[PDB]
């Protein structure tokens, strides 16, 4: 994979965090711990602190844009959710005409 | 029509358990390179011993089955003794044949170890052989005091 | 109990054991040829079991040092690579690892030798059904963890070394072919009682228990006392101590092993034994092999189990060591030390 | 010899001192090292005085 | 009437005379002879065939008195508090042969060796052949009320 | 009745698991059944208030069939560990293991011990051997001969696997060399007695069930 | 060598075509699962943590508030850890009609280029 | 009448002996065991069997007392509650001789080893009939309305 | 009417008594011929033995089967289980005798040229309790035909 | 129906039964751990008291149950009890199977080093909630089967 | 009616209870086994018995909230939901307890020799809990849906 | 009608739980073995036992979709078209999670020595998914095929 | 009756979930081990899996097929052949699965040592692969008569 312009996965960005944003507002808290990600981006990519705190370091614009579209998600479901047999109508189709 | 069963379950367990005792001795009368001095000498008295326990079961079979008659009180249902006679026979000559097999199955292989301990036992196997009575005296007795 | 199993399986190696367990050398075999000091009396007793086959076909009446390693190997080898081959399901595949324990010994050994810088060109097999140049080369050749669980994954079933190289990798155990010896040992004692505890309710065992424990009692004091005036380390395990039968202690075995030298566990382990309050190694030596002879003559009555062909696969071990020893002495002229001692076979 | 040695060890432990002086009675003897034999060269049991314990 | 209750009496002989017979088995079985001769304990193992078969001699007062009891008609009252009586005897036959027959085993072979511990294998099965008599007591108190019925 | 097509139902798969036992593992006994066979008997059998029992009156079937099937089956697994003994000797002696043939001549009688009961067990029908509880009476003499076949089949099987058993162990007699296998055919010939005397005991005990017009 | 790559393509395009379609129903599980698991918990804990006014209202709110938003706070990381189905089905189905972890590594690498 | 309570009787002493028979074969064979080494302490461990053969006196005199309270007339106000009753004091006598016999083959084992155990070993054993003595006061509760059999 | 279990017991039975047993002679067969291939003839007459008992399964499950659906009753449906039970557990025990029959004889004939006789003689000998109870279902199911 | 005198009377059986077990494996790790070291058996001993404090909550389970029961005998009667005394005794059996391995595992690794007489006797005194939750639930259970028929 | 809807409350508190029961006890063996070699490791080992007992309080308050909703006067078709969702909540309690056994077993005993696995032994015996928050979310739906009937 | 269709929803979250929870075991029993050897091969290995815990979603959805549709009144032929559904949900999720188990622990230890078989092994599990979605789709078709009417 | 269908259905696609589950996962077993001693052999080794995992289309479908036709209301026609051709199908996806997992495992495992059987057991598993079409076929077959009513 050493591709110059494609294909390397420039696809992934925009379908892989739209899409993996769908399952959470919760998204708020993502946000606000995602955003504090760039501004200790600089001193925590020379700390290595933690195991997955390098690893969400690494994929800190994966997490700050799949965080900051978790909040429409999140803050969409919690139409309206109020009893189940009732949402899931469009919840169902709307996962399909997404997809 | 249900006291045959009891009738014909008497020697069921004493056939079985006499098979397994007689089984057992002629498994455990194979070894061990020497057959003039000792076996069998006195190691046929677990085969004999336990082979009564199939003709005591078998009797009290034929006078459970002789006194049980269909032109008889049948009427009650006072029947089910038969199946307390013949269970009762047949799980103590189970319990007889199963008793002795397993013990002349080290004693037959006791004698050739040792010399001393032949007297002892035979002298274990000739008591373990009483535990078959008691079927076929309740049996007799049962069917003594009923039609 | 009796007359509850029907296992074909074990009927068949039974019988197939038992027709090479026939025409072999028994007690009074190796009595008469003891005392026998001819040639033609001692090749005429030993010429009539399954070794006498080579002296058959070869007649001799001097035993040679490569005649008596020939017809030990073609023995050993007709005796178990034909039964071993002969044999299916869980009575040849609960077979295997009994040759396969008893070739891990060696494995091990030729393993470490191996890293050890030592000279190999000739390896004998005492009871391992496979050869030393088709699993044997390929273990020893191997020195990482990774290919000996690989080679012995491809193994059906697991060996033994599998566990020992498991606690070796760590460096738990040892660093030699003795503490792996001794710790393959102990877990080799747990496994008989481990197959004899799961093989208890098809198969009737009573003459396999108490030669696994009166095998495993025997073990453990040759191994205790085999690391006597040895440099045995106090706080490895090297004295092979484990509960068998409920007289041993750890301590005891462990301590009077070590540096104590107290023969109290033999003495409190059973009244019965050759050795229970003696100190020397000649005495113990013929001790242990005449309680290690002994439960193999009264465990062949008794038919339709694996019982008797786990005895009667490790009389194998003594009757070829005492076959060597009665024919290299006798053949060389001279009288036995170890083998007239022993009265029990 | 138990009761007559602590009996005997506690009356006279305070002749030689207090930091020296143990409860002990009998003489139990092991394999591994023989103790209550009052070893001046060997690792052993010590008492305040002079105590040997002898059984035939 | 059904006519139950004539089981009671035919099984009351059965867990005991299984429990001596284990108990026999179990003390006949293993090694008694150390080299060629034994310290004379083969008159001191007598001892656990005649305490297995304690619980079966025992065992069989109760089937002969359920069996005197039972009769040839007798109704489902009678008969419904006559059955029991075996079962409570043959359980604790059965636990009382199978432990006499551990501690015949174990102290049988290690009888075998050291003849010291027939003290305590000897009041072991004494005091562990008690569950029969209070099985055989307990079948005789609910066997006492169940004659004359109605 | 639903008692046929049970019982002949849990006797197929009682055999069918039974004989997939021994054999390769390919199936496996249910395990559970007797917990729930157990615990489903001794919870409707305390309540409600009732006596729990079945009442077929003959059935007709299982007695000529159970006989000389069970006497069979009993008597065709007896030479099994025999034969694999007598021919699992081979080449180390002449002696009396290839002339004890005999014992399979007995183990062979198991087989005709209870055909010939069964046999004797049918007069002039096939269906009804005697008279049974549909249009006549007195079906005990149909009843009994389902446990008298069966206690003949048990008793001809396990004399069978006692002669089995004793032939298999008299097929080499001997551990070591210079043996006698007259002692270990000595023993097992008293066990086919049992067969004998257990199938004329049990065939007498049992009565008669034949000559139904 | 196209005639096994062609019913190969045609097996795989086939199963891919109802593998997407059918695996693309876990948003509205997860979502449903999640929005369930912290409206049970706020629902259950905002009625309770309103009541009982003055100081009561203060200190059983703040410490029923603290303890929900810390489960919750575990519960949305814990559903962004389980979110790795879009990832997954993403670089196993998705690669194959487009063109493994390059396309991973190649959004992080995008951004940063 | 119908009645189905008459197995509470046996019930009790048949897990209760099975229990003691059980703790009573795992003392003994831990004082076989501890015999061969120290004859001293065989004596001293024999009171240990006497002491967990204490626990089928309160399934006997609890089957005897329900047992004593069985009228002429068979209610549903009597039936299975001596099962319930004595068959709790069974389950309770079954698992205080379980834990017994295995407190009782460690206990001896290790005071064959060092001694100082036999008060540890007899504190746990002496400890372990608290579950029995419940199980028989409760049983004694449940047999206590055993009778007035309407 | 059950008795359609009871014909399909017969070959089931058989078939599996005569594929266990023509698995072990075959593997036993297999595993003696790789010494001497002189032996394969000779080793080779254990699995065509075993293999011969479905014949009477299957005659004896044709002639069961021909008494059904035409004519049937509550009496004319007990015999068929018992004789098919009956051929059934004596060919299933017959094959698995005659697998380990066969498989001994194979290592005894493998061994000399002695055993073979033996063998080849209790294997010829041992179709007589296949025999007796294939006569005992053309025997029961002869008489399947008394009324109606 | 007259069938819950068995529910009723298996909650103490079920922890009494725990209780055995969890004393027969202290008493095994206290045997085993008193070999090496005869001065911490006093120590070891907290296991058996601490498992057989479980009985108590089914044994006043059992008497109070015991107590509630009226005069009749019908199928009201007999499924909440049967139920509530099974819950108390599936809770201290399984409370006393965790008390016998963590009783078991202290005693033993109290043999090498003393220091986990507090870790284990945390988790061994945190793990009694199971026979408090099933007593609570027999009790409530138990609570609902008033005016028995 | 029968009113035998308490075995779906007195299954998930004896499912919950067993499962809370083997991961308290598999988590004390590894923590009591690792404690010993490393006593630094104390604090942090004390993690999965405290994660793993919390499991008990789904089935209890799942078996407190659905014994309010049984009633005085039971009926047939409301001992349904109640044994669903108490049969879930048991058999997820259980295999929650019996993962959350294993994974503190192995975390311990993998976080004994190196601590490097404690995020990871941390977040994999926290992302466990979810199933016994969904069965016990299932069972106060089910217990929600069993209280408007009667 | 009984409405006893609780059953059919209840029974998939306990097999999808069961199976779940063994594989997030079989994947934390390796992980923390396979993280001792490398630092940085937890995170990639840690990934597992959240894709055998994932499949307790469609049981939890299956089963709180299933859990409103029952509501008080029910019909005769209402509860056993989800009982598939539940049953093959469960029964595919705790296979999957079964194979799920010994294929992250085998992949999890055989990706610990060689860091390049991470992608293969990964790649391998990834494919399971397809069993859960199919099953779950299944029941969400038998479920949605259960309620036609309100 | 009320219905009978559903077991079928559920039983199609819980026995090819599970047979499809069981193979991949001793497919993923061995080519998981046997992917460290050779890494060119990854490729090849994956084959198993994937192509045992497509083994649960076919009671996916049937069951999918089988549902389509069951709404609210049903007869008792239909839940025979239904349940007859689910069993079959399910049966032979078992069978498919069961029998291909052994064949991937021995020719994952075989395929290390010599790289030459690879064509045998991807015919083998193609050869294999066939029985479940067959059973699907059938049940495809008899589910086309289970439309005729309702």
Same mark, same amino acid.
């Given at each position: 994979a050493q591709y110059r312009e494609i294909n390397?996965?420039?696809p992934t960005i925009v379908t892989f965090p739209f899409m993996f944003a769908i399952?959470?507002?919760?998204?708020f808290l993502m946000t606000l711990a995602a955003l504090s990600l760039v501004l200790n981006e600089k001193k925590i990519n020379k700390m290595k602190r933690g195991e997955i705190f390098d690893m969400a370091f690494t994929g800190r614009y994966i997490i700050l844009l799949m965080g900051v579209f978790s909040m429409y998600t999140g803050f969409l479901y919690?139409?309206?959710?109020?009893?189940?047999?009732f949402s899931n109508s469009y919840k169902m189709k709307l996962s399909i005409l997404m997809g | 029509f249900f006291g045959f069963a009891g009738c014909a379950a008497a020697m069921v367990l004493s056939c079985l358990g006499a098979a397994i005792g007689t089984a057992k001795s002629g498994i455990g009368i194979?070894?061990?390179?020497?057959?003039?001095?000792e076996l069998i000498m006195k190691s046929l008295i677990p085969v004999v011993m336990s082979g009564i326990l199939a003709i005591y079961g078998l009797v009290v079979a034929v006078l459970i089955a002789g006194n049980?008659?269909?032109?008889?009180?049948?009427?009650?249902?006072?029947?089910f003794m038969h199946l307390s006679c013949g269970l009762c026979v047949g799980f103590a000559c189970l319990s007889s044949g199963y008793a002795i097999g397993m013990v002349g199955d080290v004693g037959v292989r006791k004698y050739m170890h040792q010399p001393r301990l032949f007297v002892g036992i035979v002298l274990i196997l000739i008591f373990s052989?009483?535990?078959?009575?008691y079927g076929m005296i309740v049996a007799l007795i049962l069917n003594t005091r009923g039609s | 109990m009796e007359g509850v199993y029907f296992n074909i399986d074990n009927g068949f190696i039974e019988g197939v054991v038992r027709g090479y367990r026939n025409g072999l050398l028994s007690n009074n075999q190796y009595i008469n040829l003891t005392q026998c000091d001819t040639l033609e009396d001692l090749k005429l007793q030993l010429s !009539?079991?399954?070794?006498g086959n080579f002296l058959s076909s070869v007649s001799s009446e001097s035993l040679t040092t490569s005649l008596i390693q020939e017809y030990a190997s073609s023995k050993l080898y007709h005796e178990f690579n034909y039964i071993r081959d002969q044999s299916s399901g869980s009575t040849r595949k609960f077979m295997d690892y009994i040759t396969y324990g008893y070739m891990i010994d060696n494995v091990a050994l030729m393993i470490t030798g191996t890293i050890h810088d030592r000279d190999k060109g000739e390896i004998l097999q005492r009871?391992?059904?496979?050869?030393?140049?088709?699993t044997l080369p390929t273990l020893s050749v191997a020195t990482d963890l990774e290919s000996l669980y690989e080679t012995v994954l491809?193994?059906?079933?697991?060996?033994?070394?599998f566990k020992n190289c498991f606690d070796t990798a760590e460096e738990?155990?040892?660093?030699?072919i003795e503490i792996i010896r001794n710790k393959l040992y102990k877990a080799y004692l747990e496994d008989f009682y481990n197959f004899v505890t799961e093989e208890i309710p098809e198969p009737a065992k009573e003459c396999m228990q108490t030669l696994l424990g009166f095998e495993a009692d025997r073990r453990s004091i040759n191994i205790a006392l085999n690391s006597?005036? !040895? !440099?045995? #380390?106090?706080?490895?395990?090297? !004295?092979?101590?484990?509960?068998? #039968?409920?007289?041993?202690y750890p301590l005891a075995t462990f301590h009077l092993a070590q540096?104590?030298? &107290?023969?109290?566990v033999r003495a409190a382990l059973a009244?019965?034994?050759?050795?229970?309050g003696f100190l020397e190694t000649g005495n113990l030596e013929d001790h242990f092999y005449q309680l290690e002879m002994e439960l193999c003559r009264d465990a &062949?009555?008794?038919? &339709?189990? #694996?019982s008797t062909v786990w005895a009667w696969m490790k009389s194998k071990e003594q009757e070829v060591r005492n076959i060597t020893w009665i024919a290299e002495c006798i053949a060389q002229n001279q009288r036995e030390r170890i083998n007239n001692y022993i009265s029990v076979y | 010899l138990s009761k007559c040695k602590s009996e005997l060890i506690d009356a006279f432990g305070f002749l030689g001192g207090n930091a020296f002086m143990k409860d002990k009675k009998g003489k139990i003897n092991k394999q591994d090292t023989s103790l209550?034999?009052?070893?001046?060269?060997?690792d052993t049991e010590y008492e305040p005085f002079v105590m040997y314990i002898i059984n035939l | 009437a059904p006519f139950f209750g004539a089981i009671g009496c035919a099984s009351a002989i059965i867990f005991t005379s299984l429990g001596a017979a284990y108990g026999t088995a179990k003390s006949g079985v293993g090694i008694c002879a150390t080299?060629?001769?034994?310290?004379?304990?083969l008159f001191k193992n007598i001892v656990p065939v005649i305490m297995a078969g304690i619980i079966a001699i025992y065992g069989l007062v109760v089937s002969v008195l359920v069996c005197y009891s039972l009769g040839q008609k007798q109704a489902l009252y009678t008969g419904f508090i006559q059955l029991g009586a075996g079962l409570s005897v043959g359980l604790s036959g059965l636990a009382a042969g199978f432990a006499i027959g551990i501690v015949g085993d174990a102290g049988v072979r290690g009888s075998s060796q050291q003849p010291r511990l027939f003290v305590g294998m000897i009041l072991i099965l004494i005091f562990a052949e008690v569950l029969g008599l209070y099985g055989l007591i307990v079948a005789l108190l609910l066997n006492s009320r169940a004659t004359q019925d109605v | 009745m639903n008692k046929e097509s049970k019982d002949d139902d849990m006797s197929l798969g009682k055999f069918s698991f039974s004989h997939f036992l021994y054999y390769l593992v390919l199936i496996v006994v249910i395990v559970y059944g007797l917990y729930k066979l157990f615990t489903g008997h001794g919870s409707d059998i305390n309540f409600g208030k009732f006596l729990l029992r079945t009442s077929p009156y003959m059935? %007709?079937?299982?007695g000529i069939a159970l006989c000389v099937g069970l006497s069979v089956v009993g008597a065709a697994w007896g030479i099994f560990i025999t034969g694999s003994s007598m021919? +699992?000797? +081979?080449?180390?002696?002449?002696?009396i293991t290839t002339k004890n043939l005999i014992s399979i001549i007995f183990c062979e009688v198991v087989a005709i011990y209870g055909l010939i009961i069964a046999i004797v067990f049918?007069?002039?029908?096939?269906? %009804?051997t005697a008279e049974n509880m549909?249009?006549?009476?007195?079906l005990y003499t149909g009843y009994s001969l389902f446990w008298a076949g069966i206690t003949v089949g048990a008793s001809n099987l396990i004399c069978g696997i006692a002669v089995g058993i004793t032939g298999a162990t008299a097929?080499?007699?001997?551990?070591?060399?210079?043996?006698?296998?007259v002692k270990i055919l000595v023993i097992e010939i008293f066990g086919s007695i049992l067969g004998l005397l257990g199938l004329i005991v049990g065939l007498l005990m049992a009565g008669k069930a034949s000559e139904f017009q | 060598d196209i005639m096994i790559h062609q019913v190969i393509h045609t097996i795989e395009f086939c199963l891919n075509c109802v593998s997407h379609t059918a695996s693309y129903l876990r948003l509205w599980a997860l979502s449903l699962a999640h929005a369930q698991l912290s409206s049970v918990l706020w629902t259950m804990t905002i009625q309770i943590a309103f009541g009982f006014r003055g100081f009561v209202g203060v200190f059983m709110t703040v410490a029923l508030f603290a303890m929900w938003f810390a489960l919750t706070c575990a519960v949305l990381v814990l559903m962004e850890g389980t979110s790795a189905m879009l990832h997954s089905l993403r670089l196993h189905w998705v690669e194959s009609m487009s063109k493994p972890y390059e396309p991973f590594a190649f959004e992080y690498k995008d951004m940063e280029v």
């Open positions: 390397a996965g420039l399952m959470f507002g919760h998204g919690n139409g309206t959710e109020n009893a189940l047999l | 194979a070894g061990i390179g020497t057959f003039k001095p049980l008659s269909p032109t008889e009180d049948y009427t009650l249902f006072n029947g052989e009483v535990l078959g009575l | !009539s079991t399954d070794y009871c391992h059904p496979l050869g030393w140049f088709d491809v193994d059906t079933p697991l060996a033994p070394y738990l155990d040892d660093m030699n006597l005036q !040895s !440099s045995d #380390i106090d706080p490895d395990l090297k !004295s092979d101590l484990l509960p068998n #039968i409920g007289k041993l540096a104590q030298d &107290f023969e109290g009244n019965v034994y050759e050795y229970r &062949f009555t008794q038919q &339709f189990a #694996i | 209550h034999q009052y070893a001046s060269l060997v | 080299c060629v001769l034994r310290p004379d304990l | 059935w %007709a079937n299982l021919i +699992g000797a +081979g080449v180390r002696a002449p002696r049918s007069s002039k029908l096939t269906v %009804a549909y249009s006549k009476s007195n097929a080499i007699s001997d551990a070591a060399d210079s043996a006698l296998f | -």
